[PDB]
Amino acid sequence: XXXXXXXXXXXXXXXXXXXXXXXXXXXXXXXXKAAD
């Protein structure tokens, strides 16, 4: 046996959750489609 956890903090399913900063610094440029 000898399966126990006497420590004040002990866990196998560590709590964590990934977050997203929504980094979408997208841009664009010019074109050859200019009808002037």
């Binding site: 046996x1 000898x2 399966x3 126990x4 956890x5 006497x6």
Partner: protein, 111 residues
């Protein structure tokens, strides 16, 4: 001073257990509860844990202990009176010892 101390006989006036006489073994003033022997018997499902010299055995089955009870539900039990009854207490100060002593208000019994 305090209404309930460690040692004096006390009973319960409300709940499933009515007229439950017991001795207060310990008082937690901050959360306002009181451990009284023989009352509020709960049975933790004792698991098995082995990580220490004493935990190598830690024989624990259906150990029945004591659950704390709010002090409001407790009431002092009279002993000096021939006909024991449940009442409220005062805080008279006798000049004989200049020490505060609890006295009931439906009788003249000290403590």
């Amino acid at each position: 001073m305090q209404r309930i101390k460690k040692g004096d006989k006390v009973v319960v006036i409300t709940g499933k257990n009515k007229g439950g006489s017991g001795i207060v073994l310990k008082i937690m003033p901050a959360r306002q509860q009181a451990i009284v022997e023989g009352l509020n018997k709960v049975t933790r499902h004792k698991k098995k844990d082995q990580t220490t010299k004493r935990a190598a055995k830690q024989s624990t089955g259906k150990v029945q202990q004591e659950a704390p009870i709010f002090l409001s539900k407790l009431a002092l039990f009279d002993q000096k009176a021939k006909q024991q009854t449940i009442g409220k207490i005062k805080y008279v100060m006798d000049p004989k010892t200049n020490k505060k002593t609890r006295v009931f208000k439906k009788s003249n019994n000290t403590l």
